[PDB]
Amino acid sequence: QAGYDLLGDGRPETLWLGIGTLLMLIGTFYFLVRGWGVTDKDAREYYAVTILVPGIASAAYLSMFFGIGLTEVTVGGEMLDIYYARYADWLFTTPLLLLDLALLAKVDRVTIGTLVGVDALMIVTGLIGALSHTAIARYSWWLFSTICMIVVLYFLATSLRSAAKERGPEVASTFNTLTALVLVLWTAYPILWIIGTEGAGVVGLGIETLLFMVLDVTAKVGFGFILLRSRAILGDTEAPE
Ligand SMILES: *C\C=C(C)/C=C/C=C(C)/C=C/C1=C(C)CCCC1(C)C
Ligand SMILES: CCCCCCCCCCCCCCCC
Ligand SMILES: CCCCCCCCCCCCCCCC
Ligand SMILES: CCCCCCCCCCCCCCCC
Ligand SMILES: CCCCCCCCCCCCCCCC
Ligand SMILES: CCCCCCCCC
Ligand SMILES: CCCCCCCCC
Ligand SMILES: CCCCCCCCC
Ligand SMILES: [Ca+2]
Ligand SMILES: [Cl-]
Ligand SMILES: [Cl-]
Ligand SMILES: [Cl-]
Ligand code: NA
């Protein structure tokens, strides 16, 4: 694979996992330090949710870097590498990102339940795809998972957007900016998966790891940066519980 075998264990992709680890750690510490000087009760909720996003990713990236939770899946002759921690990361962090958006929109607990439920299904069916031993199964689970993603994105772009709008221009502008980012960035994930080692195998494990790393840092640190510098986080929130 494209990269450099940093730890001398036959894995060129550790170059990208190592860089990922550092950027996630730096992002976590940045938000944490900025968080310390925040007193508004609403701002503090946004900081708490948002710090955990690169924080959990940091742990997953460190694990993958050291080769913890790495295994092989047989698809005929081919043995595919699967990093379990990638999926565990996404399981925890995608709901947290959706919670940030739901707090801005100030939607009800049932709406939030639906959003995070379909999101969880997206990730789980992604994992089933990655562990499947035939081509037909892998592509089928990918498609099912992609339909779940579209449902999530549709809810953001319609129901949550309309709710955010009535909270006035500050909240609405921040919501719209973040949703514009999400609609593009999240859609890149299924594309990379199907052209990479898990799908068609046009791109190898090296390039794939690199590009997931860029997506992850943008979707987590980039998202957090835009959110936490907005005045909208001072506005009233109502957590689902
Ligand atoms: C780390 C932060 C984010 C926002 C990660 C997002 C990941 C996805 C949107 C993954 C989606 C997938 C789909 C739709 C199809 C199967 C494979 C994936 C799990 C990568
Ligand atoms: C309170 C407003 C939101 C409640 C919406 C009720 C309908 C629920 C739709 C469920 C969609 C799940 C998709 C499963 C994967 C395709
Ligand atoms: C109102 C529409 C809501 C649902 C949108 C889901 C599809 C997202 C399309 C964005 C495609 C970006 C491709 C970027 C890859 C380089
Ligand atoms: C033999 C040593 C090869 C070293 C290759 C270094 C290439 C540059 C790496 C930059 C990775 C992109 C970081 C993106 C940050 C979001
Ligand atoms: C003024 C802020 C300085 C410290 C910010 C730390 C963030 C480190 C992560 C690298 C940023 C990549 C995010 C991509 C932005 C689109
Ligand atoms: C042979 C040493 C390679 C070290 C890679 C550093 C990457 C800088 C971003
Ligand atoms: C305060 C830093 C965030 C920690 C997130 C949880 C990962 C450690 C087990
Ligand atoms: C919670 C972070 C996991 C990092 C594992 C380190 C293992 C050292 C060999
Ligand atoms: Ca307030
Ligand atoms: Cl404050
Ligand atoms: Cl307050
Ligand atoms: Cl490669
Ligand atoms: Na290595």
Numbering used by the authors: 7 to 247
Sentences reproduced from the published study:
The photoreceptor archaerhodopsin-3 (AR3) from the archaebacterium Halorubrum sodomense is a light-driven proton transporter. Like other microbial rhodopsins, it has seven transmembrane helices and a retinylidene chromophore created by the covalent conjugation of retinal to Lys226 via a Schiff base. AR3, along with many other microbial rhodopsins, has a desensitized, dark-adapted (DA) state which is formed from the resting, light-adapted (LA) state in the absence of light.
Transparent cyclic olefin polymer (COP) and opaque black Kapton provided light-permissive and light-tight containment, respectively, and enabled diffraction data to be collected at room temperature, significantly reducing the risk of crystal dehydration. Two different retinal conformers are modelled for each structure and the greatest apparent movement is around the β-ionone ring. All of the major structural features visible in the high-resolution cryo crystal structures were also resolved at room temperature, including the retinylidene chromophore, which is formed from the covalent conjugation of retinal to Lys226, and the conversion of the N-terminal Gln7 to a pyroglutamyl group. Arg92, which is resolved as four rotamers in the two cryo structures, is only resolved in one position in the two room-temperature structures.
